[model samples]
Target chain A: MKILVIQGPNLNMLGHRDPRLYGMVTLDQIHEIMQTFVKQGNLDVELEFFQTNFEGEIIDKIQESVGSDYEGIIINPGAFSHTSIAIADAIMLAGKPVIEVHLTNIQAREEFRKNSYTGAACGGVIMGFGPLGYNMALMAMVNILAEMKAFQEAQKNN
Target chain B: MKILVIQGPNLNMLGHRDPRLYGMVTLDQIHEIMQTFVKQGNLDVELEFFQTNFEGEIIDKIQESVGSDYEGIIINPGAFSHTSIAIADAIMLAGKPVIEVHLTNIQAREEFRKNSYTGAACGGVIMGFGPLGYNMALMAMVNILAEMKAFQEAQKNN
Candidate 1:
């Protein structure tokens, strides 16, 4: 399945920003790891990774996804998950399966971090697993897609 | 089984803190609703509900849970779930089934709410279900406590 992986805002500077919390892993390293896993599945899964520091750029990406070349989305919305209603609206309009993933378990981080605006639009959320969350989220997407396809077939059969 | 239901800061002000989203349900109303469910289960599950606007007071309550008065803990750490290592430490010491719940799905809300420090120590987290999360968390605790007791007994037998 074609999956678009969207990284938000400052996430491009993963290694430089708060290494103690985000770990010393660079953004490129994480992309390589995710790419490797996607390759192993051999299930027609392709990952397109993108990052931008601007809100409008992120909005543009979200708007672009509505054309249907992408089957699903895996987004670590960085700092945007909390308060970006505009991003939330774009995801809603995209009408594709959006799976929200987090690098760290935010529920355990800070009081200010105790909320999310992106998860409201996604199928589900995976958190607190650190970097492993990306893999877990992909797995969840595979399951969700399989289930969706099955339902579609059942409807046709009926 | 006695379960401690601890509410952290501003939770009592749920009616006032963005009431449009959290709804008209007061903390007391939630307690009453939960009590009805607990009674229906005919469970040995007794709930001790406490809310605090102070962090130290919360720490004190968690410290007190260490001595075996409660079998499980259901915590809505409010803003502390992300920032409180001290609370996480205390939950570790409690040595009981701890499940954190939220009225709003935090991951869907903001970037800051995406990282949770205290949630890392708990068995799992329940969020995004709004008020239903309270009931869901209680059910999770019941299952958790059963498995824990079974494991303890198996160890004893061995």
Candidate 2:
């Protein structure tokens, strides 16, 4: 399965943002780790990364995905997690499995951070795992896609 | 301008759901009140209602709004509020101002009801005022659309 990994706003500043909350991992390192982890697992997954500070740009990419071959999306919407309904709307439109990821434990932070508008539209949400959340989300998607394929196969047999 | 009002899943059973929480007001009564409210104000608005028990149909309507003359959407996605990213995605693609409405105060309900995934993508959210919430949303939209119109005019003039 092919998946789009979206990093939104301020996430580009990951390493410099806060070592205490977000940890000292850089965004690039996180991406590398995820790639290697998924590759070693022998999961047939094609991952593409899309990161943008602009909300509209993010929405535009999601809109473009409509006719593409991508089967799922994993998003870390950064500050937009609490404020952007547009991003959530875009994910809903993609009509693919979406797994929302957060490096920080939003629920353990500020009250506002505890709310994730984007997560509501997602097939699953993975948070509080630091940068590893991305890997976790990828694994989850792989399993979900496998189950869906199995279900479809069963339907055909029936 | 034209607007679309979408009601989702179990909302057709508004009056029968629970009198205390949802009240005895049927969805039709609420729609009639909103229509008259906008007309009496001479807001130059055209309103259309779409209620569905199926999530896919709601997504389809939202998609249909794209490239259409509809300028705004007012939706209460019922149980889909807490789920269904597809609805949120469609709204993003619709590219129109959206106002999320609820007959009851969702924040005051169960933990799950407190979260509205759909509301994150809307221009505004109105809840707890029962049927009046729809009227409130309409009025809010009128003002928002007017402001947007004025802003566009200003840009052209500049």
Candidate 3:
């Protein structure tokens, strides 16, 4: 199984943005950690990471995911979750299970940071757990993919 | 009945900002519209407009609403919604039904413009409808206050 992880906006600045909320972890470090975890577990999963400051391009990536080998999507839309329905719409179009991960508990942040328009499009949202959220998302994808395959196999037999 | 309308951040620079999303309407023009509507309707609502760039000061205004004659609050946290939680926390602390208003549908704008952290603390939210959103809040406040009176009256008789 393959998974695509998407990061939006100033996420490139990662560790430098906020230490308490986002941690001192850089984007590449988070990806490397996930990569190591997958390797260590010998999980049959391939991970691809996409990061961009452009909104429409992110939409393009998600929309193009439909019929792609990527089985699931994990997205941290940075501040985009607060407002952009287009991302939400693209996620719907992809027809893949999506998990939204936020470094901070957006609920605990400022008013504009509370709602996740994009998260609303996802299977579930993981927040406040910071870098651990990514790990959680990865593990969840494994279970979900396993179940999804089982469902398809059973359906074929039926 | 008295109503406190709180404006945050660059709202004071209205009409000069984005014309369409904000309706080329100055903050004062929108207030004047509400004031005129109240007068024309002969409504008993006493409206007070408070604008501030400081997050703490907006909190100051919202916190001050409790125990004051202001019965309900209508707030547009402007750009502050993405930046601060103080305003939302103060509203929750104020113990008053608050309505959140925004000029643009954060949905149609950039990613950061979308979530309203303070809006989560509001009883309801109105956005994208431009200055008319304020009018709706005022009218809705009048009814909410009236309903409160009816509720208290029924309780009294009971």
Candidate 4:
């Protein structure tokens, strides 16, 4: 039930930044909103959140997930989603279910931002909507974890 | 150098579909233009061009690059680049130096078109300018190959 949520650079400037593009909601606001949704949607889910502005720091966090207490992870890797191979390598090494969520659908924006380094290594990507993407990703993670647990249980029975 | 160039779905209908968005240049005209650049640049590069409408086929082509006689690969995986992990997986497995090129800047367009599933797996990506992106990527590939050869030769002497 332990879930880790990772946010990328410039995300720390959420509410104060470009409200027209990223919405007027603060990171804290999104977290509070997502927390409420997680409680109602997945009562069994436990969540931890972390945010960093450095590429190596994110990579380190991803690498640390290897032996950590995380069952699944959800990430919104912003600009890092497109250009960093180091992050990609780290995610691949983590060997966990990682869901890539973006507040804005990158493909529809600029071509440079269209490439997702994070999604390349994740279970799937959720995008387009702003803050709702976080909750949707949580719901998706809940189902994916449930499915994995069921599969593991079936394997044990066999 | 033998390079494989892959164009994704809906590209075949480029000039015919949206003369404004993709440009008035026909697919053949675009290829011809690229050929013109190759000849004018005096770059003795051989290009194997392919355009497909299916996602699996795109993945198959990327996978085929593994252990092939090609020096480098350039791809514009179109709409498939947004959500196709199979394409990304194939690129990762190919182990070849790949340059991802796009005809348009996806980030400035729509939210859904922003993320590139394949870009993370490639050596780098080029986009935001129309057809010039192809040549920019080609130039990048040329430099990448030169550096790789230099590294290999240096290792040989050592």
Please provide, for model 4 over A14-126, each residue's C-alpha lDDT reduced to its tens digit, 9 standing for 90 to 100.
88777666868888888887789877654677788899999988888877778858888889888988898888778778877887777764644677886676676675665
Evaluate every candidate with DockQ and list the scores. 0.15, 0.02, 0.03, 0.04
- Candidate 1: give its CA RMSD in angstroms: 9.5
Segments in model 1 whose C-alpha atoms lie over 4 Å from true places: B1-90, B94-158
Candidate 3: Cα lDDT at A32: 93
Name the TM-score of candidate 3: 0.52
Top lDDT hit: 3
Write candidate 2's Cα lDDT for A29-139 as tens digits.
Answer: 988988897889788888899899999988888887787678888888888988898888887888777777777645446778856677766655545556655765675
Docking class of 2: incorrect
In model 2, where do residues sit more than 4 Å from their true spots? A1-158
Give one digit per residue, the lDDT tens place, for model 3 in B30-68: 899889979986998899999988888888788788886
Reference-based TM-score of each model:
0.57, 0.52, 0.52, 0.52
Highest-DockQ candidate: 1
What do the candidate models score in CA lDDT, each in turn?
0.76, 0.76, 0.78, 0.76
True contacts kept of 3: 0.03
Instruction: Please tell me which model should have the higher lDDT, number 1 or number 3.
Output: 3
